[PDB]
Enzyme design. Structure first.
Site, PDB file in Angstrom:
ATOM      1  N   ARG A 174     -15.988  11.026   7.253  1.00 10.68           N
ATOM      2  CA  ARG A 174     -14.863  11.693   7.900  1.00 10.68           C
ATOM      3  C   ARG A 174     -14.424  12.930   7.115  1.00 10.68           C
ATOM      4  NH1 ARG A 174     -10.857   7.342   7.386  1.00 10.68           N
ATOM      5  NH2 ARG A 174      -9.326   8.815   8.265  1.00 10.68           N
ATOM      6  N   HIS A 218       0.844  -1.180   0.000  1.00  9.46           N
ATOM      7  CA  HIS A 218       0.000   0.000   0.000  1.00  9.46           C
ATOM      8  C   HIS A 218       0.882   1.233   0.000  1.00  9.46           C
ATOM      9  CE1 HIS A 218      -2.988   3.073   0.759  1.00  9.46           C
ATOM     10  NE2 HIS A 218      -2.101   3.570   1.602  1.00  9.46           N
ATOM     11  N   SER A 252      -8.458   2.273   8.302  1.00 12.68           N
ATOM     12  CA  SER A 252      -8.948   2.441   6.937  1.00 12.68           C
ATOM     13  C   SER A 252      -8.000   1.799   5.928  1.00 12.68           C
ATOM     14  CB  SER A 252      -9.114   3.929   6.634  1.00 12.68           C
ATOM     15  OG  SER A 252      -9.473   4.134   5.286  1.00 12.68           O
ATOM     16  N   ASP A 264     -15.698   1.158   5.165  1.00 12.11           N
ATOM     17  CA  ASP A 264     -14.644   2.157   5.066  1.00 12.11           C
ATOM     18  C   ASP A 264     -14.978   3.203   4.012  1.00 12.11           C
ATOM     19  OD1 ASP A 264     -11.880   3.189   5.603  1.00 12.11           O
ATOM     20  OD2 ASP A 264     -11.616   2.630   3.525  1.00 12.11           O
ATOM     21  N   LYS A 321      -8.490  -2.245   3.817  1.00  9.80           N
ATOM     22  CA  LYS A 321      -8.569  -2.493   2.382  1.00  9.80           C
ATOM     23  C   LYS A 321      -7.579  -3.572   1.947  1.00  9.80           C
ATOM     24  CE  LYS A 321      -8.395   1.961   1.423  1.00  9.80           C
ATOM     25  NZ  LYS A 321      -8.913   2.738   2.572  1.00  9.80           N
TER      26      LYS A 321
END
Length: 433
Positions: A168, A82, A183, A161, A187
């Site tokens: 948010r 990520h 979050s 999410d 994923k």
């Protein structure tokens, strides 16, 4: 009244139970818990925080809020990266065949979407013939055979999410470590990763402004991963200027081929080796990070990484000969040098704005339906710290259009020249445990 008691409990600085966190996520997901209670909880979390157990519980509840991907038929330990990404970041393109050349299984799921350049699919489609239409069974067999494949990702992952992040964003609760870390991690977990490598960008323009802030987020995500049984490692790297030289789609495939040969820009070489080292150790294909780097360096030099990239393209319909001759890639009709108006040292390249200029040439989607010209983009000719003389090109624009004046003005507004400059160190910190 249960949600109100949950809000008050967090408000008072207490830990929420596993039950309460799951109740909240699943009830927010299915519409029985309204936006205004979720925003109140998120704000109470913003102030009061969450323990490591709460953070893990929230991560997994978001994982389990919708569909999940089972990659267990793919032999080995599937490591995914990520990154919040950044302009010029070719690491995903380079890393997939590079570590696959060491038999690290790369089961890559990506897409297109908005941004300053295309997604991984868009960049790979700059290669002719390449397409992602694979069944799950074909996808599994290609990774088992060749250790790398790409399929389009699901759009029904972590629905909780997707809802919560959007909420948010309009309630001032993005900037909470427990919320950010759960979050991001959820994923990757829902996508079926066995282990996770984090590239956390920092520096001017990045979401985490300081190394210390980025390290705090990375450590929280590493703790979550280890608590939920998905071993996780992080690199904190600098994003104050774009990575490498090529900013676009086909231009980044071309540059990525250089990086796969062991050549190409120094910064992307170092970041790819640093990220790849963690992936190789996590997949148990080397015992230490120094040994992993040595093995990656070696498949760069002996051409096995390049060979893996050819196999990967070939297996999904692409013309693999483009690796040996990248001029076969889409070329832009116009090549415009933007000469430096002053002499000195390049002292700043506002990375995000160079990305916008690239998009304004057609390299990425501003809105959902926009078309990408895969041939257009920008070649930086100088990086921060490089000397420059008047008239010497700062960037070369690759355009399908004769007039790019707006792109020229944006480049000029966002590249500074001073009498002295020193680029930031690229690799700030590693979190390996």
């Amino acid at each position: 009244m249960r949600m109100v008691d949950i809000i008050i409990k967090k408000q008072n600085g207490k830990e929420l139970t596993t039950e309460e966190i799951q109740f909240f996520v699943n009830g927010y997901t299915d519409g029985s818990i309204p936006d205004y209670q979720a925003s109140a909880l998120a704000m109470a979390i913003f102030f009061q925080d969450m323990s490591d157990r709460e953070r893990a519980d929230l991560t997994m509840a978001m994982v389990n809020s919708g569909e999940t991907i089972d990659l267990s038929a793919i032999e080995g330990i599937k490591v995914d990266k990520h990154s919040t990404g950044g302009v010029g970041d070719t690491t995903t393109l380079v890393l997939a065949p590079l570590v696959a050349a060491l038999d690290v299984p790369v089961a890559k799921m990506s897409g297109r979407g908005l941004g300053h350049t295309g997604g991984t699919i868009d960049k790979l489609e700059a290669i002719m013939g390449f397409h992602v239409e694979l069944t799950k069974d074909e996808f599994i067999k290609l990774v088992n055979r060749d250790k790398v494949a790409v399929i389009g990702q699901s759009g029904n992952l972590t629905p909780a999410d997707k809802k919560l992040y959007a909420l948010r964003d309009v309630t001032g609760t993005v900037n909470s470590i427990p919320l950010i870390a759960s979050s991001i991690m959820s994923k990757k977990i829902a996508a079926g990763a066995d282990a996770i490598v984090l590239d956390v960008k920092t520096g001017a323009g990045a979401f985490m402004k300081t190394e210390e802030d980025a390290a705090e987020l990375a450590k929280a995500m590493v703790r979550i991963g280890n608590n939920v049984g998905r071993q996780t490692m992080a690199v904190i790297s600098d994003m104050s200027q774009p990575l490498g030289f090529a900013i676009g789609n086909a231009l980044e495939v071309k540059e990525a081929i250089d990086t796969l040969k062991g050549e190409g820009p120094e910064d992307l070489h170092e970041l790819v080796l640093t990220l790849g080292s963690q992936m190789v150790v996590l997949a148990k294909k080397a015992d230490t990070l120094d040994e992993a780097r040595a093995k990656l360096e070696e498949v760069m030099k002996n051409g096995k990484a390049l060979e893996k990239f050819k196999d990967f393209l070939k297996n999904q319909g692409g013309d693999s000969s483009i690796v040996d001759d990248p001029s076969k890639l889409p070329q832009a009709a116009y090549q415009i040098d933007v000469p430096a108006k002053e002499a000195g040292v390049v002292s700043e390249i506002v990375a995000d704005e160079i990305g916008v200029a690239a998009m304004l040439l057609g390299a990425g989607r501003a809105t959902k339906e926009d078309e990408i010209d895969l041939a257009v983009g920008i070649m930086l000719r100088k990086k921060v710290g490089d000397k420059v003389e008047k008239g010497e090109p700062l960037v070369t624009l690759y355009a399908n259009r004769e007039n790019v004046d707006e792109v020229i003005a944006k480049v000029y507004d966002n590249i500074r020249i001073a009498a002295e400059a020193k680029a930031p160190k690229l690799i700030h910190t590693l979190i390996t445990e």
